[PDB]
From Swiss-Prot, chain A:
Binding partners and assembly: Component of the small ribosomal subunit (SSU). Mature yeast ribosomes consist of a small (40S) and a large (60S) subunit. The 40S small subunit contains 1 molecule of ribosomal RNA (18S rRNA) and 33 different proteins (encoded by 57 genes). The large 60S subunit contains 3 rRNA molecules (25S, 5.8S and 5S rRNA) and 46 different proteins (encoded by 81 genes).
Protein family (similarity comment): Belongs to the universal ribosomal protein uS7 family.
Coiled coil stretches, renumbered: none
Alphabetical list of Pfam families matching this protein: Ribosomal_S7 (PF00177)
Protein name: Small ribosomal subunit protein uS7
GO terms under biological process: cytoplasmic translation; maturation of SSU-rRNA; regulation of translational fidelity; ribosomal small subunit assembly; ribosomal subunit export from nucleus; translation
Modified sites of kind Phosphothreonine: 15
Sorted UniProt keywords: Acetylation, Cytoplasm, Isopeptide bond, Phosphoprotein, Ribonucleoprotein, Ribosomal protein, Ubl conjugation
Subcellular location: Cytoplasm
Keyword Cytoplasm (UniProt): yes
GO molecular function terms attached to this record: mRNA binding; rRNA binding; structural constituent of ribosome
UniProtKB/Swiss-Prot annotation, chain B:
Protein's organism: Saccharomyces cerevisiae (strain ATCC 204508 / S288c) (Baker's yeast)
PANTHER family: PERIODIC TRYPTOPHAN PROTEIN 2 HOMOLOG, WD40 REPEAT PROTEIN
Localization per record: Nucleus, Nucleolus
Database matches in InterPro entries: Apc4-like_WD40_dom, G-protein_beta_WD-40_rep, PWP2, Quinoprotein_ADH-like_sf, SSU_processome_Utp12, WD40/YVTN_repeat-like_dom_sf, WD40_repeat_CS, WD40_repeat_dom_sf
Protein name per Swiss-Prot or TrEMBL: Periodic tryptophan protein 2
One Pfam family it belongs to: Utp12
Curated annotation (Swiss-Prot), chain C:
Highest taxon, organism lineage: Eukaryota
N-terminal signal peptide: none
Subunit structure: Component of the small ribosomal subunit (SSU). Mature yeast ribosomes consist of a small (40S) and a large (60S) subunit. The 40S small subunit contains 1 molecule of ribosomal RNA (18S rRNA) and 33 different proteins (encoded by 57 genes). The large 60S subunit contains 3 rRNA molecules (25S, 5.8S and 5S rRNA) and 46 different proteins (encoded by 81 genes).
Any single Gene Ontology cellular-component annotation: cytosolic small ribosomal subunit
This protein's UniProt keywords: Acetylation, Cytoplasm, Isopeptide bond, Phosphoprotein, Ribonucleoprotein, Ribosomal protein, Ubl conjugation
Note: Present with 33800 molecules/cell in log phase SD medium. There are 2 genes for uS9 in yeast.
SUPFAM superfamilies, alphabetized: Ribosomal protein S5 domain 2-like
Phosphoserine: residues carrying this PTM: 32, 59, 74
Chain positions found as Phosphothreonine: 68
Sites of the Glycyl lysine isopeptide (Lys-Gly) (interchain with G-Cter in ubiquitin) crosslink: 28, 45, 57
Protein name: Small ribosomal subunit protein uS9A
Primary role: Component of the ribosome, a large ribonucleoprotein complex responsible for the synthesis of proteins in the cell. The small ribosomal subunit (SSU) binds messenger RNAs (mRNAs) and translates the encoded message by selecting cognate aminoacyl-transfer RNA (tRNA) molecules. The large subunit (LSU) contains the ribosomal catalytic site termed the peptidyl transferase center (PTC), which catalyzes the formation of peptide bonds, thereby polymerizing the amino acids delivered by tRNAs into a polypeptide chain.
From Swiss-Prot, chain E:
Subunit structure, interactors included: Interacts with snoRNA U3. Interacts with MPP10. Interacts (via WD repeats) with UTP18. Component of the ribosomal small subunit (SSU) processome composed of at least 40 protein subunits and snoRNA U3.
A Pfam short name: Beta-prop_WDR36-Utp21_1st
Gene that encodes it: UTP21
Domain-related comment: The WD repeats are grouped into two tandem seven-bladed beta-propeller regions.
The name this protein goes by in its record: U3 small nucleolar RNA-associated protein 21
UniProt keyword terms in alphabetical order: Acetylation, Nucleus, Phosphoprotein, Repeat, Ribonucleoprotein, Ribosome biogenesis, rRNA processing, WD repeat
Other observations noted: Present with 2020 molecules/cell in log phase SD medium.
Length: 213, 793, 125, 39, 820
RNA sequence: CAGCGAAGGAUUUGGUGGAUUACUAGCUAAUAGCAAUCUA
């Protein structure tokens, strides 16, 4: 048929480079394990806000996303998960610890549910983000709520927030750690099991909006 | 797309040399620097010849059949051009500085004054093919002792009368048998003999000199041997004669002096018909119409060109250009005219078709740096080095607004709002951007944050975000409107000169001093892609400098860039004699244009002959908003490069059964839509015009509704470039109405495809059709008044 | 005597000088190989100038990087910047300009902070 | 003129009835180009 | 066959062909007139500049040419032409059918020897005119008197005599009395050349064995003899600047110099010209000068100079050898490949079978220069191979020049005969480059190309594999393997985006270039021999093996034309620069032009030599062809650059044949239509008072139209004359007692704008009427005739709001569609 | 050392010739003469 030759000598270097590292020059995988192609966002209106189309090697892109309004809609969603994981007074700044426990939770997500953990966390985002909410229409403070819709950036924000703080309180004083509780949370949120803090909170917010619609 | 050819040369109506008229004196041929411009003064249009001398041209003549031109430059490199085909026939090097060239009245011979030899050659045919040596020498006469200043043929092409710096004038017969009729020489002048003419009957000879004497010579007895019968004197004391001509049929002697004053006399009685002044600079050229009714004068210092009818004391045109001093240009929002901001302190509004200046504006007391249109051709803003931005109504021609700062700085670039509330301007000594309201006059803001001189400003045309870019290697994006006061700085590799902005406001292309054109996404401030342009730049070698053109760092970067209106291309120019255009998806050079081959300019030759001058540079480039062209403000003038669809067979998915024969069979069999799409797949202008005129009015809307969407910009841009000059006004408006009604949603959702084809259509509706509708409306209302009211006493 | 090229990579206070010259293909950071650059979770941040363009660009040149200052993550960002713009400058000066701006296009499509840092800050609102 | 011609890079060049008024604006055949408010 | 597109212009690159040239002397300068086939060329001997080329090609080859002061005498098939400044002044027909093959000119006499050993004497009419013109007598050298006439000369101070040098004898004729004065003794070997010495009554004879005789033509003896063993002597010349040297010229290409005073041999220039092309054919000293001009049959003309002697006292015995001075030259073998170097049509690259790449100038023949083959240094520092005895590269099959990056790096990429790598060249330096691109499959290079970015060169091998190298750094970038038989054509887009390859297995492959994919593959019905890509219109043409030319576009990958008609193998073809025509040339001795819009053959030329190369200029100026015989490049100019040619097919709607459409005057009588004229005439008419402030037949035709009720001639005169005339005719219209001329004008305008033509002018004529004397119409309002004339004018004029709401719709909807 | 490597290789330099603008011939007292000479 037709084939292109574009290297003309088997490439060998003087510094020995590991075989999986030099295998990573044909496709960029997260932590050299998890592929970014065939990772779709199975809910439209959240594609163009959960970003999985520039593959990365680690969740530590030091780029600047907090100086325009919707610029954090194209931080990769693994890194948005990581950044939301490193928040409380105890664990502020510790992005390498957050990256390391994201690596551990994607390994154990894959070893429990034998599928792509990036696809699992993307399904967890698109199942967790609430599609309706209530504002408090004031009237000076008349305690009545009015149901509003909710924009997709707010849905991705509140999805990552619900998932991460659900993993924290689920790891609060049990035997499991943050990596294992976050793995359980992301798996249950991906399949949508109503056993997770995150989609129970989504179902409560959507049900209250349905109530005082 | 990329197949631009040199169309026109706006600005610079005259540089150096002699003006010529046609025989039927409708066009005048004017030597601009090394081109030749031809202005048709009745059919209001103009063109410039494509060919190019290597030095400034000094002599022009075309024969009275109108069929071929010969142009000689200032060291004798003649070029013979076919005047109708507009293609050069021969290049012939006479070896020294030729003062004049003239064709005979019977067209078949020409003579020229090369040094102190009068040499007569005989004219090659226009019908013959090009030979290796088409000119066949008739003779070369040497009787003068110093250089010959002028020729004059007799009415019959039988004698020739030449005038020299040597203080005589001589008459030579063309053929050898009449050598005894013409052997005399005419002495008696104190200075250079500037002209020598016959009378209508070839009995009197008038010889005009530089000091101001005109001698009448007659064949009388005091035997009969050419006495001098009367000497008349001009008595212009300080000034002296710079150019002489004589219309022998109307007995009209026209004389221009070195003081701008020209006088015109009725010669054998020497009565001053008129005396008036061009200006203060000397009158370098006088030329006269064949009927003697128009006089074209050229002054070479300010580059000005009059043609003036002396019966009705009135100037047919007054047109002064700008050599070497032109800082900016801007197309009108329909591509009908170009506004030029020039270094002597003035704005000039040049029509493009007729190559002349309509209005000029002198209220800046220093070099105007930028012009920019706004409010859809109603207002025009300019900023200069005298510290002022100011606004110009192009209806009442009034400077109605003047914006200054508080710091006494000089402004180098500006940018207006789309919704023209705010003007904005940046300097090269202040690091701030000055933001003025246009409605009130006040200084609305001073944006600060650059740490280097703000080289360029541009407002995004759609979302109205300001982009400035400065020599601190930084492009910066300011959200001014609505509570933001938001600043986004994008750093770049080197210091920026000429930012430019996409028509949809999505991206911004900056030119850097490295030599590159980088293209950035505005909203997500990351680089989309760059062109590396410093190796397809023609940087010539100057005469004064002692470093090669390869190692020079003078001009290997672009100081002005501009987007195309579909957003897909960038034209670019700088202080070099190449202008380059690229397509920004592929980042590849489409075409590079050599803007000058004049060796009288400086940076033209890369390699200098091993045996200050005005350098060549382009200061502003812009694309045309209506028709597929660009203007470049070089030192020679406003170079206008445009494609045309008459040449270049470039089909669009034709197959073997798609043929002009097939198209006229489908037209004769009246499948009108099939004939129209066959002509579109041919992409042949005559075939599209033939089918377009053959479709009847009964089924314009069926065809226009069934046109496929890929042939929509072709039929729209065809209708535009056809309907500007075509007479079928109701036919073209029926087609426009049918196309806009049938497919005017596709246009609205594909704006930037039909962004230059729709601007060309409303260049037809408001500029010929609305003028006609205004005339018929005024006639209707004057009728209703003149018959409906009471005229009694 | 050898064709060599020196570039600089900077983040906050780390700074890395990279010398690139023609050789056999060895990439050495602070004397040790590139496969020893700790904190070992950002070793792929160091690797991505190699994996973005292929190791066949590095098969004929040897790089050495000297990194001072900074902290762990500022040093890996200085290393990757120095390696990237050193490869670009070597292919500019001693290989062809087409591979030069292909490398610039690949690095700029990944992130232009491999080639241009974000340097002077803050903003006084 | 003379101080800014030597303080520059690029080159800078330098009774009868009428001086023909070669430089003149306002003309696309405009006569009453005043504003209606101006009138 | 005469053509109708291209007309012959010149045949460039030719300097000599081995006819012995003539020297001539105007004043104290010298010119050198050399024959190139059927034209001669005059050169300025102080600088070897081409002054003149003869104006017309002679009907056969020029075979003997001489030159007195201003005039050049060129003898071809039967007749002698007398030429001044190239332009022929006279033509002397001889009364024989024998071919004239020698001539001399002395006095009033021109003497021309034919090949039947007859001599024709021609005389001036009166000794003041310029050239011998009238017939005088005929002389005959019969077999008793001498052999074949081998030279014809006049040695000086011989009052109207002629030295005739036959092959064995030397005769001396008196050409006024027609007599044979003196016949010498025989010579024991056949003499080939003769030259008169500057010694009085001495001629010098050169034999076919190796000896120069110095015959004394008055004593009848021989003075001396010079022996050069085994060398046939082809030239003799004498030095005339106080140094008695002789220069003999030997048909093995040698120029030997003798001192006659001290009988020694000064020097030998060996291999001064090629023996295979004739050796040194004419060598002559410019007289009084130490410079000698040689010329050979290998298309070369050289000058050699003697420097002054290096010993300051002896001099005459220490003679410094002759050194080389200027020379002109061209190809010695017919060229094999042709390209244009630039878009200006100034230089053209040209490769020949004598293994040289020349760069010939179309503007000035002094600028023609041989591209040098002096190799660079190796990049690493190793040794380069090859023979020590340096020879030229194998003869060039193909080449591709793309001067986008010119002067920057290597610019030309060329492919040689039966060798597996393609060299590069630099046109700026005019020399070879540093890179030779290999094919990497042990196959010969069958095609080359290079992109118009100038970065990439493409090699197409005979084992079907395209390799893409970088022109700057010389290394393999990519390698496509689609074909299995030889790849004969590679080209690429003008945007470096899609490449197109064609092999002689008859598949055209379409590849994306940035991505390395293939876009498609199209199987034709014959092996493809040659591709030409027209790059602006994206249409490439293939010369198939079934003797058709398949024109196929690269965008949609279809065969869009197929041109039939050639009878043998298509040697070459090329697109017009506008891409409208394609000119091909084939081994049936023909050149055809095809209008690929209409798909037919516009013109055909039967040319006697087979044209092996055809190239257009990159402007539409010139066609350059290259034929099988002839060392030069034939140059044609397209007459369709000055006129327009009909695209109507030859063998063995005139507006659509001339590609025009004169737009018809009005499309329908119910359609408004402006004037055929300038648009500004309406505005000039409406405001010509303020414009100028800022700066009868009519009455008779109006009356006659009022009689006949048909104002067509009136309106024709109105649309004809000028705005001052229009205002001056409308302003004088008898507005006083009965008002006839006003109402005749009004219903004339009614009849006018009933016809829907020129209607903006009829509208301004009504506006000018109301402006000039609408006050009298308002005065005698309710007058019956003028009120009825205005009534029917309004009756026709009220149907003009069609234009109003038509432009209202177009303006409103165009604004809405553009903005929102 | 390996490698490259055809009766040698590298570096430096002086001189001359040709291009560095697009080729209609020299001289003079120039409608022609001269160019061997303008002068009786």
């Amino acid at each position: 048929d037709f084939e292109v030759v574009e290297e003309f000598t088997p490439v060998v270097l003087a510094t020995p480079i590991p075989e999986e590292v030099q295998q990573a020059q044909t496709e960029i995988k997260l932590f050299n394990k998890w592929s970014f192609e065939e990772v779709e966002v199975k809910d439209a209106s959240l594609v163009d806000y959960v970003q999985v189309r520039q593959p990365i090697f680690v969740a530590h892109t030091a780029g600047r996303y907090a100086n325009k309004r919707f610029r954090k809609a194209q931080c990769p969603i693994i890194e948005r998960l990581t950044n939301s994981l490193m928040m409380n007074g105890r664990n502020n700044g510790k992005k390498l610890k957050a990256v390391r426990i994201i690596k551990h939770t994607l390994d154990i997500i894959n070893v429990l549910t034998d599928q792509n953990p990036i696809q699992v966390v993307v399904d967890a985002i698109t199942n967790t983000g609430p599609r309706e909410d209530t504002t408090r229409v004031g009237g000076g403070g008349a305690a009545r709520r009015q149901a509003v819709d909710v924009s997709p950036l707010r849905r991705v924000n509140q999805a990552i927030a619900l998932l991460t703080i659900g993993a924290r309180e689920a790891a609060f004083r049990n035997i499991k750690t943050i990596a294992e509780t976050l793995a359980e949370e992301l798996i249950n949120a991906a399949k949508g099991s109503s056993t997770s803090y995150a989609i129970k909170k989504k179902d409560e917010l959507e049900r209250v909006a349905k109530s005082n619609r | 797309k990329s197949d631009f050819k040199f169309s026109n040369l706006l600005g610079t109506v005259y540089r150096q040399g002699n003006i010529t008229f046609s025989d039927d004196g409708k066009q005048l041929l004017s030597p601009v620097g090394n081109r030749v411009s031809v202005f048709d003064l009745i059919n209001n249009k103009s063109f410039t010849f494509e060919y190019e001398h290597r030095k400034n041209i000094a002599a022009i003549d075309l024969n009275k059949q109108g069929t071929l031109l010969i142009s000689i430059d200032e060291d004798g490199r003649a070029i013979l051009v076919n005047f109708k085909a507009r293609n050069v026939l021969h290049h012939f090097n006479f070896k020294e500085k030729c003062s004049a060239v003239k064709f005979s009245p019977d067209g078949r011979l020409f003579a020229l004054a090369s040094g102190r030899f009068l040499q007569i050659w005989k004219t090659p045919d226009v019908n013959k093919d090009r030979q290796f040596a088409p000119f066949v020498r008739h003779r070369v006469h040497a009787g003068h002792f110093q250089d010959i200043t002028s020729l004059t043929w007799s009415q019959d092409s039988r004698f020739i009368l030449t005038t020299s710096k040597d203080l005589s004038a001589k008459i030579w017969s063309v053929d050898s048998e009449e050598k005894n009729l013409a052997a005399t020489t005419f002495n008696g002048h104190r200075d250079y003999v500037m002209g020598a003419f016959f009378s209508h009957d070839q009995e009197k000879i008038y010889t005009v000199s530089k000091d101001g004497a005109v001698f009448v010579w007659e064949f009388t007895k005091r035997k009969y041997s050419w006495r001098i019968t009367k000497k008349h004197f001009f008595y212009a004391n300080q000034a002296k004669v710079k150019c002489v001509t004589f219309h022998p049929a109307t007995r009209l002697l026209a004389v221009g002096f070195t003081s701008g004053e020209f006088r015109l006399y009725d010669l054998p009685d020497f009565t001053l018909i008129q005396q008036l002044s061009m200006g203060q600079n000397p009158v370098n050229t006088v030329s006269v119409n064949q009927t003697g009714e128009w006089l074209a004068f050229g002054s070479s210092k300010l580059g000005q060109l009059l043609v003036y009818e002396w019966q009705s004391e009135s100037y047919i045109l007054k047109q002064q250009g700008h050599f070497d001093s032109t800082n900016s240009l801007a197309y009108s929002p329909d591509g009908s005219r170009v506004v030029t901001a020039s270094e002597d302190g003035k704005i000039k509004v040049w029509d493009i078709t007729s190559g002349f200046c309509l209005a000029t504006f002198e209220e800046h007391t220093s070099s105007v740096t930028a012009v920019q249109f706004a409010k859809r051709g109603q207002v025009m803003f300019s900023s200069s080095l005298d510290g002022t931005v100011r606004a110009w109504d192009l209806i009442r021609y009034r400077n109605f607004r003047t914006f200054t700062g508080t710091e006494r700085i000089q402004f180098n670039c500006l940018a207006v709002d789309p919704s023209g509330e705010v003007v904005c301007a940046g300097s090269l000594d202040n690091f701030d951007i000055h933001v003025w309201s246009v409605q009130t006059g006040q200084l609305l803001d001073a944006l600060s944050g650059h740490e280097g001189p703000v080289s360029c400003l541009s407002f995004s045309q759609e979302n109205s975000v300001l982009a400035s870019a400065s020599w601190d290697k930084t492009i910066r994006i300011w959200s001014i409107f609505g509570r933001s006061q938001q600043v986004e700085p994008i750093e770049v590799y080197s210091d920026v000169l000429a930012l430019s902005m996409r028509p949809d406001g999505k991206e911004v292309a900056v030119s850097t001093l490295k030599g590159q054109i980088s293209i950035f996404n505005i909203e997500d401030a990351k680089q989309v892609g760059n062109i590396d342009c410093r190796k397809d730049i023609i940087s010539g070698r100057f005469n004064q400098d002692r470093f090669t053109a390869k190692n020079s760092e003078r001009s290997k970067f672009f100081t002005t860039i501009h987007y195309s209106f579909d957003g897909m291309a960038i034209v670019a120019g700088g202080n070099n004699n190449s202008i380059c255009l690229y397509d920004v998806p592929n980042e590849v050079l489409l075409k590079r244009f050599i803007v000058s081959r004049n060796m009288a300019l400086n940076g033209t030759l890369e390699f200098l002959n091993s045996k200050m001058r005005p350098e060549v540079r382009v200061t502003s480039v812009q694309f045309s908003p209506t028709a597929n062209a660009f203007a470049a403000a070089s030192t020679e003038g406003l170079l206008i490069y445009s494609t045309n669809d008459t040449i270049l067979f470039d089909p669009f998915d034709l197959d073997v059964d798609v043929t002009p024969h097939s198209t006229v069979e489908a037209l004769r069999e009246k499948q009108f839509l099939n004939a129209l799409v066959m002509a579109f797949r041919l992409n042949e202008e005559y075939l599209i015009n033939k089918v377009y005129e053959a479709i009847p009015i009964k089924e314009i809307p069926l065809v226009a509704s069934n046109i496929p969407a890929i042939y929509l910009p072709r039929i729209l841009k065809f209708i535009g470039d056809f309907a500007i000059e075509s007479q079928h006004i109701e036919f073209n408006l029926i087609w426009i109405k049918a196309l806009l009604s049938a497919s005017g949603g596709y246009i609205n959702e594909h704006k930037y495809l039909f962004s230059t084809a729709m601007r060309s259509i409303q260049r037809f509706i408001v500029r010929v059709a609305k003028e006609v509708v205004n005339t018929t409306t005024d006639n209707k209302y004057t009728y209703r008044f003149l018959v409906s009211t009471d005229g009694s006493m | 005597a050898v064709p060599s090229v020196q570039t600089f990579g900077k983040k906050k206070s780390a700074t890395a000088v990279a010398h690139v010259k023609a050789g056999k293909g060895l990439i050495k950071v602070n004397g040790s190989p590139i496969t020893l650059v700790e904190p070992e979770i950002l070793r792929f941040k160091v690797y991505e100038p190699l994996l973005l363009v292929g190791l066949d660009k590095f098969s004929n040149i040897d790089i050495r990087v000297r990194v001072t200052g900074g902290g762990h993550v500022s040093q890996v960002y200085a290393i990757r910047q120095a390696i990237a713009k050193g490869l670009v400058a070597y292919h500019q000066k001693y290989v062809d300009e087409q591979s030069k701006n292909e490398l610039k296009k690949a690095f700029t499509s990944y992130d232009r902070t491999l080639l241009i840092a974000d340097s002077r800050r803050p903003e006084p609102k | 003129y003379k101080l800014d011609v030597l303080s520059s890079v690029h080159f800078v060049p330098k009774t009868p009835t009428i001086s023909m008024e070669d430089a003149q604006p306002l003309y696309m055949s405009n006569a009453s180009s005043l504003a209606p408010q101006e009138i | 066959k005469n053509s109708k597109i291209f007309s012959p212009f010149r045949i460039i690159g030719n300097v000599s062909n081995g006819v012995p040239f003539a020297t001539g002397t105007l004043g104290s300068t010298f010119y050198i007139v050399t024959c190139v086939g059927k034209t001669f060329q005059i050169y300025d001997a102080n600088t070897l500049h081409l002054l003149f080329v003869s104006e017309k090609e002679t009907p056969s080859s020029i075979v003997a040419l001489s030159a007195h002061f201003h005039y050049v005498y060129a003898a071809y098939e039967n007749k002698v032409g007398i030429y001044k400044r190239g332009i022929e002044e006279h033509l002397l027909e001889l009364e024989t059918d024998a071919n004239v093959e020698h001539l001399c000119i002395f006095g009033d006499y021109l003497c021309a020897s034919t090949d039947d050993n007859s001599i024709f004497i021609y005389k001036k009419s009166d000794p003041q005119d310029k050239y011998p013109s009238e017939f005088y007598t005929k002389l005959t050298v019969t077999e008793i008197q001498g052999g074949e006439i081998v030279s014809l000369q006049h040695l000086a101070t011989y009052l109207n005599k002629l030295t005739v040098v036959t092959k064995s004898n030397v005769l001396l004729f008196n050409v006024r009395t027609g007599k044979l004065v003196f016949t010498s003794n025989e010579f024991p070997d056949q003499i080939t050349t003769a030259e008169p010495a500057p010694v009085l009554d001495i001629i010098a004879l050169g034999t076919v064995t190796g000896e120069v005789i110095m015959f004394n033509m008055r004593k009848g003896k021989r003075i001396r003899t010079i022996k050069i063993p085994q060398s046939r002597i082809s030239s003799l010349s004498f030095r005339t600047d106080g140094s008695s040297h002789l220069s003999v010229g030997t048909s093995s290409g040698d120029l030997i110099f003798y001192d006659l005073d001290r009988r020694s041999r000064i020097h030998v220039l060996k291999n001064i010209h090629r023996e295979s092309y004739g050796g040194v054919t004419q060598a002559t000293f410019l007289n009084g000068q130490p410079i000698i001009v040689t010329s050979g049959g290998d298309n070369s003309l050289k000058e050699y100079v003697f420097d002054p002697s290096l010993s300051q006292g002896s001099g005459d015995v220490v003679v410094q050898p002759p050194r080389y001075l200027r020379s002109r030259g061209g190809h010695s073998q017919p060229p094999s490949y042709i390209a244009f170097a630039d878009s200006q049509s100034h230089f053209m690259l040209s490769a020949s079978k004598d293994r040289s790449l020349w760069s010939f100038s179309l503007r000035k023949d002094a600028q023609s220069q041989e591209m040098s083959q002096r190799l660079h240094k190796k990049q690493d520092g190793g040794r380069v191979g090859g023979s020590t005895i340096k020879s030229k590269f194998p003869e060039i099959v193909a080449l591709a020049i793309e001067n986008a990056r010119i002067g920057e790096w290597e610019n030309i990429i060329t492919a040689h005969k039966d060798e597996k790598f393609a060299r590069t060249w630099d046109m700026r330096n005019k020399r070879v480059g540093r890179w030779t691109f290999d094919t990497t499959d042990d196959g010969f290079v069958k095609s080359v190309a290079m992109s118009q970015c100038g970065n990439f060169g493409f090699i197409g091998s005979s084992n079907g594999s395209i390799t893409i190298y970088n022109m700057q750094s010389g290394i393999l970038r990519k390698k496509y393997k689609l074909h299995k038989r030889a790849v004969t054509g590679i080209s690429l887009d003008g945007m470096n985006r899609k490449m197109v390859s064609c092999g002689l297995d008859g598949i055209v492959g379409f590849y994306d270039f940035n991505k390395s994919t293939l876009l498609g593959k199209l199987k034709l019905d014959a092996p493809i021999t040659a591709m030409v890509y027209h790059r602006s219109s994206d249409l490439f043409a293939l010369a198939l093996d079934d003797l058709s030319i398949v024109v196929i576009d690269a965008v949609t990958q279809r065969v869009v034309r197929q041109l039939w008609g050639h009878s043998n193998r298509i040697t070459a073809f090329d697109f017009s620069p506008e891409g409208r025509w394609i000119v091909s040339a084939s081994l049936d001795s023909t050149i055809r032009t095809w209008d690929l819009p209409t798909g037919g053959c516009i013109d055909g030329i039967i040319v006697d030599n087979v044209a092996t190369n055809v190239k257009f200029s990159p402007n539409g100026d010139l066609l350059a062809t290259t034929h099988v015989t002839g060392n030069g490049i034939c140059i044609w100019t397209n007459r369709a650059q000055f006129k327009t040619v009909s695209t109507r097919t030859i063998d063995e709607l005139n507006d659509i044949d001339f590609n025009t459409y004169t737009s018809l005057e009005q499309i329908d009588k119910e359609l408004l239509t402006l004037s055929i004229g300038p648009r500004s005439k309406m505005n000039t008419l409406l405001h010509l008072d303020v414009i100028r402030k800022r700066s009868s037949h009519f009455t008779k035709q109006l009356r006659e139209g009022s009689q006949s009720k048909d104002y067509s001639s009136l309106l024709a005169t109105l649309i004809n004359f000028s705005p001052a005339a229009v205002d001056l005719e409308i302003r004088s219209l008898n507005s006083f007692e009965p008002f006839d001329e006003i109402v005749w004008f009004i219903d004339a305008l009614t009849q006018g704008l009933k016809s829907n033509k020129n209607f903006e002018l009829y509208e301004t004529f009504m506006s000018l009427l109301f402006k000039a004397h609408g006050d009298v119409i308002h005065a005698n309002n309710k007058n019956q005739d003028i009120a009825s004339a205005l009534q029917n004018w309004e009756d026709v004029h009220k149907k003009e709001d069609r234009l109003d709401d038509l432009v209202k719709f177009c303006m409103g909807v165009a604004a809405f569609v553009t903005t929102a």
